[PDB]
Amino acid sequence: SLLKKLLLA
Amino acid sequence: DLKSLAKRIYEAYLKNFNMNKVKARVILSPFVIHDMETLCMAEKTLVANKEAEVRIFHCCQCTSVETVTELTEFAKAIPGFANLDLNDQVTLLKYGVYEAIFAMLSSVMNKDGMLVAYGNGFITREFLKSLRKPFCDIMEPKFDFAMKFNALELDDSDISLFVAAIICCGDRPGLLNVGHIEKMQEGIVHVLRLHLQSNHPDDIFLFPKLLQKMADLRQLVTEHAQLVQIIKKTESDAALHPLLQEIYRDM
Ligand SMILES: CCOCCc1cc(C(=O)O)c2c(C(CC)CC)nn(-c3ccc(F)cc3)c2n1
């Protein structure tokens, strides 16, 4: 998910 | 540790949001968009075919995507947010970002319009209403919320803690560690209470006012998602950004 992608920056 | 929580959250707010209340009021005190003519003039400079309402829709949703990314980095800087399981972090952001977006959006709004394009444009409230439905039905409840929210005369230090309390909400559907997130909110809320006591000694009832604002925002977002689905299903050219459709999905 993109939100996961944002939170794993 | 709670002794530095208020300063830490305020610093993270100043660090991560391109626009805040101090910056907005300076500007509001910018190309004015008030008709189809000035909209086209503004777009000639601030934008690198589709119907005018679909163009504003895209500029609006592109703004939200940027705010969602800023809110994501803000939440990362809230002490204890990163310690939560990653699925809990997604849930808090999923349900929290649009409550925070409409709360912070008040900072760039007055009774006549709102700042757009990173402070470079100002679109009038009447022009948005003059649009065709359902696009003219979107911003009216946000201006009304912003008008009563702005009357509380919060500053960026108040708003930073308010947004932190919005994100760290233990009530969201599907949360795993409810008891710990609730304790995180209790600390943020307690620091907010203390801050409102010092920063707004003239209104010893400001904190219950803000509690109601959090409830008002949850209703403002649920009604807003209904409009998102109206546009997703009945507007072909109004494509949804993948990140936003992820957020609005099952919410
Ligand atoms: C400051 C920039 O953001 C403003 C605030 C804003 C936010 C959203 C949002 O849900 O992300 C949004 C939308 C969504 C569909 C309902 C896009 C997913 N549509 N509109 C909107 C469109 C046309 C208008 F004429 C006025 C508002 C919006 N506006």
mmCIF file of C-alpha atoms and ligand atoms in Angstrom:
data_model
loop_
_atom_site.group_PDB
_atom_site.id
_atom_site.type_symbol
_atom_site.label_atom_id
_atom_site.label_comp_id
_atom_site.label_asym_id
_atom_site.label_seq_id
_atom_site.Cartn_x
_atom_site.Cartn_y
_atom_site.Cartn_z
ATOM 1 C CA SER A 1 0.000 0.000 0.000
ATOM 2 C CA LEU A 2 1.185 3.516 -0.613
ATOM 3 C CA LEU A 3 0.588 4.560 3.000
ATOM 4 C CA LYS A 4 2.938 1.757 4.034
ATOM 5 C CA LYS A 5 5.412 3.084 1.458
ATOM 6 C CA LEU A 6 5.182 6.555 3.009
ATOM 7 C CA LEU A 7 5.735 5.201 6.526
ATOM 8 C CA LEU A 8 8.817 3.157 5.526
ATOM 9 C CA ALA A 9 10.712 6.211 4.232
ATOM 10 C CA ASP B 1 8.737 12.317 28.031
ATOM 11 C CA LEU B 2 5.938 14.849 28.469
ATOM 12 C CA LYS B 3 8.018 17.819 29.665
ATOM 13 C CA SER B 4 9.228 18.481 26.099
ATOM 14 C CA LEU B 5 6.227 17.014 24.243
ATOM 15 C CA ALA B 6 4.566 20.337 23.384
ATOM 16 C CA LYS B 7 7.771 21.879 22.030
ATOM 17 C CA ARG B 8 8.674 18.679 20.167
ATOM 18 C CA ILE B 9 5.291 18.457 18.441
ATOM 19 C CA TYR B 10 5.348 22.177 17.624
ATOM 20 C CA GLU B 11 8.841 21.873 16.144
ATOM 21 C CA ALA B 12 7.777 18.851 14.063
ATOM 22 C CA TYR B 13 4.795 20.880 12.813
ATOM 23 C CA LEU B 14 6.968 23.814 11.759
ATOM 24 C CA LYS B 15 9.448 21.370 10.200
ATOM 25 C CA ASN B 16 7.022 19.376 8.079
ATOM 26 C CA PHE B 17 4.166 21.604 6.832
ATOM 27 C CA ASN B 18 4.952 23.939 3.937
ATOM 28 C CA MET B 19 2.162 26.259 5.043
ATOM 29 C CA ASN B 20 1.107 27.258 8.542
ATOM 30 C CA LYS B 21 -1.026 29.978 10.110
ATOM 31 C CA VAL B 22 1.742 32.565 10.565
ATOM 32 C CA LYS B 23 2.844 32.154 6.944
ATOM 33 C CA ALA B 24 -0.756 32.245 5.699
ATOM 34 C CA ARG B 25 -1.849 35.338 7.579
ATOM 35 C CA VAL B 26 1.191 37.257 6.286
ATOM 36 C CA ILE B 27 0.138 36.453 2.715
ATOM 37 C CA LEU B 28 -3.575 37.005 3.417
ATOM 38 C CA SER B 29 -2.676 40.425 4.869
ATOM 39 C CA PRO B 30 -1.240 36.291 -4.460
ATOM 40 C CA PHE B 31 -3.190 36.052 -7.708
ATOM 41 C CA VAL B 32 -6.934 36.302 -7.041
ATOM 42 C CA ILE B 33 -9.056 33.683 -8.819
ATOM 43 C CA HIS B 34 -12.661 34.901 -8.965
ATOM 44 C CA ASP B 35 -14.010 33.775 -12.365
ATOM 45 C CA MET B 36 -13.218 31.559 -15.340
ATOM 46 C CA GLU B 37 -10.999 34.322 -16.744
ATOM 47 C CA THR B 38 -8.711 34.683 -13.725
ATOM 48 C CA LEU B 39 -8.682 30.903 -13.275
ATOM 49 C CA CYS B 40 -7.165 30.556 -16.751
ATOM 50 C CA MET B 41 -4.667 33.365 -16.130
ATOM 51 C CA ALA B 42 -3.548 31.722 -12.881
ATOM 52 C CA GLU B 43 -3.264 28.269 -14.468
ATOM 53 C CA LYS B 44 -1.102 29.787 -17.213
ATOM 54 C CA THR B 45 1.596 30.544 -14.609
ATOM 55 C CA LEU B 46 1.155 28.065 -11.748
ATOM 56 C CA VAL B 47 0.338 24.911 -13.767
ATOM 57 C CA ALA B 48 2.541 22.992 -16.205
ATOM 58 C CA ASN B 49 -7.783 20.540 -21.598
ATOM 59 C CA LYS B 50 -10.319 19.086 -19.168
ATOM 60 C CA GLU B 51 -13.378 20.862 -17.783
ATOM 61 C CA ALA B 52 -12.710 23.736 -15.380
ATOM 62 C CA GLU B 53 -14.217 21.883 -12.418
ATOM 63 C CA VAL B 54 -12.160 18.764 -13.173
ATOM 64 C CA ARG B 55 -9.021 20.927 -13.310
ATOM 65 C CA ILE B 56 -9.699 22.442 -9.878
ATOM 66 C CA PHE B 57 -10.531 18.941 -8.616
ATOM 67 C CA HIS B 58 -7.089 17.735 -9.699
ATOM 68 C CA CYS B 59 -5.295 20.749 -8.208
ATOM 69 C CA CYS B 60 -7.255 20.149 -4.999
ATOM 70 C CA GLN B 61 -6.460 16.437 -4.775
ATOM 71 C CA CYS B 62 -2.811 17.044 -5.675
ATOM 72 C CA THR B 63 -2.659 19.460 -2.744
ATOM 73 C CA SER B 64 -4.151 16.813 -0.446
ATOM 74 C CA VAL B 65 -1.587 14.223 -1.563
ATOM 75 C CA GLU B 66 1.173 16.645 -0.551
ATOM 76 C CA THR B 67 -0.512 17.365 2.787
ATOM 77 C CA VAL B 68 -0.907 13.625 3.410
ATOM 78 C CA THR B 69 2.841 13.203 2.886
ATOM 79 C CA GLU B 70 3.605 16.083 5.255
ATOM 80 C CA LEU B 71 1.215 14.627 7.846
ATOM 81 C CA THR B 72 2.949 11.263 7.487
ATOM 82 C CA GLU B 73 6.329 12.766 8.357
ATOM 83 C CA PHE B 74 4.703 14.780 11.148
ATOM 84 C CA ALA B 75 3.234 11.643 12.723
ATOM 85 C CA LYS B 76 6.649 9.957 12.518
ATOM 86 C CA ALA B 77 7.998 12.727 14.756
ATOM 87 C CA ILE B 78 5.254 12.286 17.379
ATOM 88 C CA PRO B 79 6.987 10.435 20.257
ATOM 89 C CA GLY B 80 5.738 6.859 20.372
ATOM 90 C CA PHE B 81 4.097 6.779 16.936
ATOM 91 C CA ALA B 82 7.020 4.901 15.370
ATOM 92 C CA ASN B 83 6.974 2.287 18.153
ATOM 93 C CA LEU B 84 3.482 1.165 17.127
ATOM 94 C CA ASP B 85 3.078 -1.754 14.765
ATOM 95 C CA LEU B 86 3.165 -0.608 11.156
ATOM 96 C CA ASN B 87 -0.449 -1.677 10.573
ATOM 97 C CA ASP B 88 -1.496 0.582 13.454
ATOM 98 C CA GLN B 89 0.459 3.459 11.901
ATOM 99 C CA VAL B 90 -1.399 3.004 8.603
ATOM 100 C CA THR B 91 -4.778 2.883 10.367
ATOM 101 C CA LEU B 92 -4.164 6.100 12.318
ATOM 102 C CA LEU B 93 -3.088 7.936 9.172
ATOM 103 C CA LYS B 94 -5.918 6.448 7.082
ATOM 104 C CA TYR B 95 -8.650 7.798 9.357
ATOM 105 C CA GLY B 96 -6.784 10.837 10.662
ATOM 106 C CA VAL B 97 -5.328 12.723 7.701
ATOM 107 C CA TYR B 98 -8.530 14.287 6.412
ATOM 108 C CA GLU B 99 -9.662 15.441 9.849
ATOM 109 C CA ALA B 100 -6.259 17.111 10.122
ATOM 110 C CA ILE B 101 -6.412 18.421 6.533
ATOM 111 C CA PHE B 102 -9.693 20.252 7.072
ATOM 112 C CA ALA B 103 -8.539 21.495 10.478
ATOM 113 C CA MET B 104 -5.311 22.956 9.036
ATOM 114 C CA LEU B 105 -7.114 24.174 5.917
ATOM 115 C CA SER B 106 -8.827 26.732 8.169
ATOM 116 C CA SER B 107 -5.440 28.443 8.529
ATOM 117 C CA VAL B 108 -5.467 29.415 4.830
ATOM 118 C CA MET B 109 -9.156 30.437 4.775
ATOM 119 C CA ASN B 110 -10.997 33.642 5.503
ATOM 120 C CA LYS B 111 -14.639 34.549 4.900
ATOM 121 C CA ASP B 112 -13.889 35.487 1.263
ATOM 122 C CA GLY B 113 -11.708 32.628 0.023
ATOM 123 C CA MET B 114 -8.709 30.405 0.581
ATOM 124 C CA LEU B 115 -5.049 30.279 -0.393
ATOM 125 C CA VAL B 116 -4.009 27.754 -3.049
ATOM 126 C CA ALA B 117 -0.852 26.782 -4.946
ATOM 127 C CA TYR B 118 1.542 27.083 -1.989
ATOM 128 C CA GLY B 119 0.426 30.620 -1.177
ATOM 129 C CA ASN B 120 0.624 31.903 -4.754
ATOM 130 C CA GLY B 121 -3.118 31.925 -5.487
ATOM 131 C CA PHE B 122 -6.308 32.937 -3.701
ATOM 132 C CA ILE B 123 -9.594 31.478 -4.970
ATOM 133 C CA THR B 124 -12.795 33.199 -3.898
ATOM 134 C CA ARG B 125 -15.549 31.467 -1.957
ATOM 135 C CA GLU B 126 -18.153 32.722 -4.437
ATOM 136 C CA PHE B 127 -16.348 31.283 -7.468
ATOM 137 C CA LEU B 128 -16.345 27.791 -5.950
ATOM 138 C CA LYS B 129 -20.092 28.061 -5.342
ATOM 139 C CA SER B 130 -20.578 29.401 -8.885
ATOM 140 C CA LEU B 131 -19.247 26.089 -10.239
ATOM 141 C CA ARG B 132 -21.470 23.257 -11.434
ATOM 142 C CA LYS B 133 -22.684 20.492 -9.155
ATOM 143 C CA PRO B 134 -21.450 18.475 -7.401
ATOM 144 C CA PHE B 135 -18.155 20.388 -7.424
ATOM 145 C CA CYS B 136 -19.827 23.500 -5.991
ATOM 146 C CA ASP B 137 -21.112 21.417 -3.048
ATOM 147 C CA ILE B 138 -17.665 20.494 -1.708
ATOM 148 C CA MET B 139 -16.078 23.513 -0.044
ATOM 149 C CA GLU B 140 -19.134 25.103 1.589
ATOM 150 C CA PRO B 141 -19.106 22.940 4.772
ATOM 151 C CA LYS B 142 -15.333 23.438 5.098
ATOM 152 C CA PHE B 143 -15.621 27.229 4.996
ATOM 153 C CA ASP B 144 -18.361 27.012 7.629
ATOM 154 C CA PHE B 145 -16.208 24.810 9.867
ATOM 155 C CA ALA B 146 -13.178 27.045 9.310
ATOM 156 C CA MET B 147 -15.166 30.145 10.234
ATOM 157 C CA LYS B 148 -16.070 28.878 13.706
ATOM 158 C CA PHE B 149 -12.677 27.191 14.137
ATOM 159 C CA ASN B 150 -10.846 30.424 13.282
ATOM 160 C CA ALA B 151 -12.948 32.319 15.840
ATOM 161 C CA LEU B 152 -11.128 30.367 18.571
ATOM 162 C CA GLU B 153 -7.978 32.281 17.512
ATOM 163 C CA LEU B 154 -5.630 29.327 17.902
ATOM 164 C CA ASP B 155 -2.001 29.780 16.874
ATOM 165 C CA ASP B 156 0.333 27.262 15.257
ATOM 166 C CA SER B 157 1.450 26.083 18.706
ATOM 167 C CA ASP B 158 -2.166 25.223 19.589
ATOM 168 C CA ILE B 159 -2.866 23.691 16.171
ATOM 169 C CA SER B 160 0.217 21.444 16.241
ATOM 170 C CA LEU B 161 -0.991 19.716 19.412
ATOM 171 C CA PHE B 162 -4.553 19.582 18.062
ATOM 172 C CA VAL B 163 -3.409 17.761 14.920
ATOM 173 C CA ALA B 164 -1.267 15.383 16.986
ATOM 174 C CA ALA B 165 -4.344 14.513 19.075
ATOM 175 C CA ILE B 166 -6.338 13.963 15.871
ATOM 176 C CA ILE B 167 -3.796 11.474 14.513
ATOM 177 C CA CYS B 168 -3.196 9.556 17.757
ATOM 178 C CA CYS B 169 -6.848 8.573 18.129
ATOM 179 C CA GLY B 170 -7.439 5.212 19.811
ATOM 180 C CA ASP B 171 -11.004 5.060 18.480
ATOM 181 C CA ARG B 172 -10.145 4.244 14.861
ATOM 182 C CA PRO B 173 -11.570 1.026 13.377
ATOM 183 C CA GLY B 174 -9.175 -1.891 13.194
ATOM 184 C CA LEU B 175 -6.566 -0.603 15.642
ATOM 185 C CA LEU B 176 -4.487 -3.282 17.363
ATOM 186 C CA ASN B 177 -2.869 -1.657 20.415
ATOM 187 C CA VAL B 178 -5.864 0.406 21.500
ATOM 188 C CA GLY B 179 -4.781 0.741 25.129
ATOM 189 C CA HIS B 180 -1.337 2.107 24.282
ATOM 190 C CA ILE B 181 -2.559 4.483 21.568
ATOM 191 C CA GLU B 182 -5.181 5.701 24.045
ATOM 192 C CA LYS B 183 -2.364 6.409 26.507
ATOM 193 C CA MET B 184 -0.462 8.266 23.788
ATOM 194 C CA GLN B 185 -3.530 10.411 23.136
ATOM 195 C CA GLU B 186 -4.025 10.967 26.865
ATOM 196 C CA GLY B 187 -0.530 12.433 27.077
ATOM 197 C CA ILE B 188 -0.969 14.587 23.973
ATOM 198 C CA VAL B 189 -4.389 15.745 25.185
ATOM 199 C CA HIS B 190 -3.037 16.478 28.666
ATOM 200 C CA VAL B 191 -0.208 18.539 27.159
ATOM 201 C CA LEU B 192 -2.795 20.318 24.997
ATOM 202 C CA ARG B 193 -4.909 21.138 28.073
ATOM 203 C CA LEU B 194 -1.884 22.587 29.856
ATOM 204 C CA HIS B 195 -0.868 24.544 26.756
ATOM 205 C CA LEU B 196 -4.344 26.021 26.300
ATOM 206 C CA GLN B 197 -4.304 27.067 29.965
ATOM 207 C CA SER B 198 -1.074 29.036 29.480
ATOM 208 C CA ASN B 199 -1.643 30.265 25.921
ATOM 209 C CA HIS B 200 -5.347 31.190 26.250
ATOM 210 C CA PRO B 201 -5.942 32.234 29.877
ATOM 211 C CA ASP B 202 -8.842 34.421 28.713
ATOM 212 C CA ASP B 203 -10.935 31.352 27.742
ATOM 213 C CA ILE B 204 -10.873 28.763 30.525
ATOM 214 C CA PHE B 205 -13.376 26.708 28.491
ATOM 215 C CA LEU B 206 -11.368 26.491 25.254
ATOM 216 C CA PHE B 207 -10.488 22.808 25.721
ATOM 217 C CA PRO B 208 -14.083 21.433 25.636
ATOM 218 C CA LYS B 209 -14.645 23.630 22.570
ATOM 219 C CA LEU B 210 -11.755 21.819 20.867
ATOM 220 C CA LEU B 211 -13.080 18.395 21.890
ATOM 221 C CA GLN B 212 -16.299 19.226 20.046
ATOM 222 C CA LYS B 213 -14.290 20.403 17.028
ATOM 223 C CA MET B 214 -12.728 16.936 16.822
ATOM 224 C CA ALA B 215 -16.209 15.399 16.699
ATOM 225 C CA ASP B 216 -17.351 17.971 14.125
ATOM 226 C CA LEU B 217 -14.377 17.065 11.916
ATOM 227 C CA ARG B 218 -15.143 13.340 12.013
ATOM 228 C CA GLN B 219 -18.626 14.123 10.689
ATOM 229 C CA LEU B 220 -17.205 16.537 8.103
ATOM 230 C CA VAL B 221 -14.936 13.797 6.735
ATOM 231 C CA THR B 222 -17.566 11.036 6.625
ATOM 232 C CA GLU B 223 -19.857 13.280 4.579
ATOM 233 C CA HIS B 224 -16.874 14.260 2.421
ATOM 234 C CA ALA B 225 -16.089 10.630 1.565
ATOM 235 C CA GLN B 226 -19.638 10.311 0.241
ATOM 236 C CA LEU B 227 -18.810 13.020 -2.309
ATOM 237 C CA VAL B 228 -15.557 11.247 -3.203
ATOM 238 C CA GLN B 229 -17.539 8.131 -4.137
ATOM 239 C CA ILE B 230 -20.082 10.211 -6.082
ATOM 240 C CA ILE B 231 -17.221 11.572 -8.197
ATOM 241 C CA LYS B 232 -15.361 8.255 -8.496
ATOM 242 C CA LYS B 233 -18.402 6.466 -9.936
ATOM 243 C CA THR B 234 -20.134 9.233 -11.928
ATOM 244 C CA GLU B 235 -17.264 11.433 -13.218
ATOM 245 C CA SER B 236 -15.084 9.782 -15.860
ATOM 246 C CA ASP B 237 -12.450 12.500 -16.309
ATOM 247 C CA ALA B 238 -12.165 13.000 -12.527
ATOM 248 C CA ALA B 239 -9.665 10.225 -11.918
ATOM 249 C CA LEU B 240 -8.735 9.520 -8.306
ATOM 250 C CA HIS B 241 -5.140 9.666 -7.143
ATOM 251 C CA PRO B 242 -3.946 6.185 -6.067
ATOM 252 C CA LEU B 243 -2.994 7.439 -2.595
ATOM 253 C CA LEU B 244 -6.374 9.096 -2.035
ATOM 254 C CA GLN B 245 -8.362 6.106 -3.296
ATOM 255 C CA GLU B 246 -6.277 4.009 -0.900
ATOM 256 C CA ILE B 247 -7.240 6.333 1.958
ATOM 257 C CA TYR B 248 -10.947 6.570 1.099
ATOM 258 C CA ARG B 249 -11.238 2.817 0.437
ATOM 259 C CA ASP B 250 -13.332 1.117 3.139
ATOM 260 C CA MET B 251 -13.545 4.314 5.196
HETATM 261 C C1 LIG C 1 -6.806 23.736 -0.865
HETATM 262 C C2 LIG C 1 -6.929 22.549 -1.821
HETATM 263 O O1 LIG C 1 -7.722 21.561 -1.219
HETATM 264 C C3 LIG C 1 -9.039 21.961 -0.982
HETATM 265 C C4 LIG C 1 -9.713 20.876 -0.143
HETATM 266 C C5 LIG C 1 -10.238 19.699 -0.966
HETATM 267 C C6 LIG C 1 -9.914 18.393 -0.586
HETATM 268 C C7 LIG C 1 -10.398 17.310 -1.326
HETATM 269 C C8 LIG C 1 -10.031 15.892 -0.913
HETATM 270 O O2 LIG C 1 -10.912 15.067 -0.562
HETATM 271 O O3 LIG C 1 -8.815 15.559 -0.938
HETATM 272 C C9 LIG C 1 -11.202 17.574 -2.441
HETATM 273 C C10 LIG C 1 -11.884 16.817 -3.458
HETATM 274 C C11 LIG C 1 -11.933 15.294 -3.598
HETATM 275 C C12 LIG C 1 -13.261 14.783 -4.165
HETATM 276 C C13 LIG C 1 -14.487 15.288 -3.401
HETATM 277 C C14 LIG C 1 -10.741 14.727 -4.359
HETATM 278 C C15 LIG C 1 -10.431 13.309 -3.888
HETATM 279 N N1 LIG C 1 -12.484 17.662 -4.253
HETATM 280 N N2 LIG C 1 -12.259 18.900 -3.846
HETATM 281 C C16 LIG C 1 -12.778 20.049 -4.557
HETATM 282 C C17 LIG C 1 -12.976 19.903 -5.920
HETATM 283 C C18 LIG C 1 -13.460 20.952 -6.676
HETATM 284 C C19 LIG C 1 -13.738 22.158 -6.068
HETATM 285 F F1 LIG C 1 -14.215 23.188 -6.820
HETATM 286 C C20 LIG C 1 -13.531 22.316 -4.704
HETATM 287 C C21 LIG C 1 -13.046 21.260 -3.945
HETATM 288 C C22 LIG C 1 -11.481 18.909 -2.759
HETATM 289 N N3 LIG C 1 -11.001 19.919 -2.026
#
